[PDB]
Design a protein around this ligand. Structure first.
Ligand SMILES: O=c1c(O)c(-c2ccc(O)c(O)c2)oc2cc(O)cc(O)c12
Length: 274
């Protein structure tokens, strides 16, 4: 087989998620993203059904890879002496939500509703597959600008979903809940809802609501942009200080602010000018 099945293109990005390059599967010109991850920098390892040591990221991706398009799919992976190479889907054209928000500022509520709904559907799919992302944020969401479809990326801080407490976390701090800040303890679902509240605020205000630990613990949300009362209400519910006071995914999707969502294709035609 060998890495020769792909043609490497420009470097797309680099950070705590490794180095990701644009690529093309040679056998059928399929667009792909090629992620290199150094073995030394992988902290959380897992096991494949057959007893092979792979990055947790590979285990989680396999569990969420199938028909549904709300998550970027793992097409293949390789092991090198000092690294792992993951071959992932690559929509074209695409822009991550962080760059999209940097360029356009705060999003109209109609656009934030379509986007947020799609993130909720993707997170539900991950949880239904027994996977917790633990790093939901704008930088980890890609927008397929032609189809108006959002795709979750970088499962490198994720874990298998469980009903017991998590005492470890290596995702983004400014998106982490007060219970992790103060006690180093959180439950998967409620911590995810907290990050979804941070993300929703980020979408409708153009920036995250909290920067310091003190602000997260206090949980007081100030709106810097004009935002409807219903949206503000949903945000404040997602950012409730007590985990049990937060909405479940069902309660979020049945909220009045979430009604009459646009389909992804309508979303692109009206807001992505495509
Ligand atoms: O298709 C793409 C993709 O999958 C990824 C990706 C996947 C997993 C990661 O962990 C990550 O950091 C990036 O980035 C991209 C960046 C681009 O500019 C354009 C793309 O088409 C992709």
């Amino acid at each position: 087989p060998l890495e020769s099945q792909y043609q490497v293109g420009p470097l797309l990005g680099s950070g705590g998620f490794g180095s990701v390059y644009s690529g093309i599967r040679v056998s059928d010109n399929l667009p792909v993203a090629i992620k290199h991850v150094e073995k030394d920098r992988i902290s959380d390892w897992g096991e494949l059904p057959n007893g092979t040591r792979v990055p947790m990221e590979v285990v989680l991706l396999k569990k969420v890879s199938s028909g549904f398009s709300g998550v970027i799919r793992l097409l293949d992976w390789f092991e090198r002496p000092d690294s792992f190479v993951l071959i992932l889907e690559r929509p074209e054209p695409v822009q991550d939500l962080f760059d999209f928000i940097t360029e356009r500022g705060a999003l109209q509520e109609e656009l934030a509703r379509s986007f947020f709904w799609q993130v909720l559907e993707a997170v539900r799919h991950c949880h239904n597959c027994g996977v917790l992302h633990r790093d939901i944020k704008d930088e980890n969401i890609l927008i397929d600008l032609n189809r108006g479809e959002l795709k979750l990326i970088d499962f490198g801080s994720g874990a298998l979903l469980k009903d017991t407490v998590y005492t470890d976390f290596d995702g983004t701090r400014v998106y982490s809940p007060p219970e992790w800040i103060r006690y180093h303890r959180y439950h998967g679902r409620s911590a995810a809802v907290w990050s979804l509240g941070i993300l929703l605020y980020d979408m409708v205000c153009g920036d995250i609501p909290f920067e310091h630990d003190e602000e997260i613990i206090r949980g007081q949300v100030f709106f810097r942009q004009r935002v409807s009362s219903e949206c503000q209400h949903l945000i404040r519910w997602c950012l409730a200080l007590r985990p049990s006071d937060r909405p479940t995914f069902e309660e979020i999707q049945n909220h009045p602010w979430m009604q009459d969502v646009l389909l992804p294709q309508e979303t692109a035609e009206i807001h992505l000018h495509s």
